Amino acid sequence: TLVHVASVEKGRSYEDFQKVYNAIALKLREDDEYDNYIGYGPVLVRLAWHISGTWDKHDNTGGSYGGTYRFKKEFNDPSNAGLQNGFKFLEPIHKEFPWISSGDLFSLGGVTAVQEMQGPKIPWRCGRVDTPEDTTPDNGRLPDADKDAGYVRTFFQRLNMNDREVVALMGAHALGKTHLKNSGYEGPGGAANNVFTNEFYLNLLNEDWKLEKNDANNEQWDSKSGYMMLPTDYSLIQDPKYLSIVKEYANDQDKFFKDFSKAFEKLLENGITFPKDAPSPFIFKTLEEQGL
Numbered sequence: 001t002l003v004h005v006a007s008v009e010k011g012r013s014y015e016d017f018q019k020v021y022n023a024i025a026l027k028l029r030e031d032d033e034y035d036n037y038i039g040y041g042p043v044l045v046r047l048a049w050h051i052s053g054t055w056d057k058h059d060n061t062g063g064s065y066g067g068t069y070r071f072k073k074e075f076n077d078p079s080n081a082g083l084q085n086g087f088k089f090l091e092p093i094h095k096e097f098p099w100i101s102s103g104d105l106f107s108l109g110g111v112t113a114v115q116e117m118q119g120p121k122i123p124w125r126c127g128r129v130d131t132p133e134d135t136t137p138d139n140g141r142l143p144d145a146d147k148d149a150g151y152v153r154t155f156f157q158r159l160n161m162n163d164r165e166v167v168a169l170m171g172a173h174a175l176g177k178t179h180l181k182n183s184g185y186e187g188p189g190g191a192a193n194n195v196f197t198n199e200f201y202l203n204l205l206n207e208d209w210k211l212e213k214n215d216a217n218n219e220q221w222d223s224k225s226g227y228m229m230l231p232t233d234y235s236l237i238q239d240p241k242y243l244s245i246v247k248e249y250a251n252d253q254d255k256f257f258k259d260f261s262k263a264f265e266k267l268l269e270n271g272i273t274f275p276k277d278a279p280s281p282f283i284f285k286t287l288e289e290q291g292l
């Protein structure tokens with residue numbers, strides 16, 4: 001069995017990590033022009049997810065622990081096209097705080113982004129430890145977007161996620177947009193794409209979606225409002241079990257926030273064993289809460 005035990009960066013405590021959070025948050029505020037004024041929040045959330053979503057529950061390969069996205073096999077995964085922008089954003093942060101591990105930095109970037117975009121608090125734990133280049137997972141473990149609900153359910157079971165966790169996590173697609181050159185899909189999902197809300201679910205249910213091909217010859221669902229849904233997004237209103245949960249979150253943002261926060265922490269921690277004397281999870285203050 002392959003076990004990864006969280007090991008706190010030597011001598012570091014909550015306050016040290018809050019300083020890293022603050023540096024990420026200050027740079028997020030500064031770099032507001034990125035991606036036609038969306039800012040870096042969405043791509044940092046996607047980075048935190050993609051470095052975690054290589055995990056395989058069966059043998060504990062992949063996952064956030066090892067920080068392996070720093071190695072070219074993983075950095076160059078076609079599934080990760082565009083994430084280099086997030087890595088480049090985090091580079092000056094890592095320079096300022098060289099003591100933090102890569103997996104801790106990448107995952108903390110996603111937590112910081114969600115919170116600074118007015119999302120829920122996401123508890124976060126330190127202690128991911130960089131592992132060598134030969135531990136980098138092969139490409140092909142991240143999901144395809146052209147597929148249906150059965151594919152989504154099966155995929156997420158590899159990450160030990162159930163229906164509620166899947167539907168909650170997908171709500172992150174309120175953020176950012178698809179970019180044709182990255183993924184072969186184009187467009188935002190709504191008007192509020194750098195503030196964290198339940199808009200994904202509302203737009204899934206309330207827009208009039210039309211199936212179209214895009215300029216890369218791929219099918220996607222488009223609305224007159226200029227929004228889009230991936231086939232895997234749209235699958236959440238095709239499957240009866242997913243549809244029930246989509247309606248729940250469309251009706252109740254507080255419940256979505258609570259479930260997202262739990263699922264996202266779980267995603268970022270998959271594969272990691274936290275020893276009993278490990279610090280409790282940290283809840284970082286936003287810049288606003290600190291007067292910064």
Ligand code: HEM
Nearest residue numbers: 042043045046049143144145169172176177178179182183
């Ligand atoms: C079935 C699972 C999923 C599929 C197929 C999928 C697919 C995609 C695709 C194709 C894009 C567009 C990339 C680009 O063109 O730049 C995207 C963007 C994004 N994904 Fe997902 N995704 C999935 C799950 C998730 C999850 C679980 C999260 C996080 C909780 C997430 C967060 C995001 C974010 C924030 C963006 C916007 C990035 C940006 O604007 O640069 N995705 N996803």
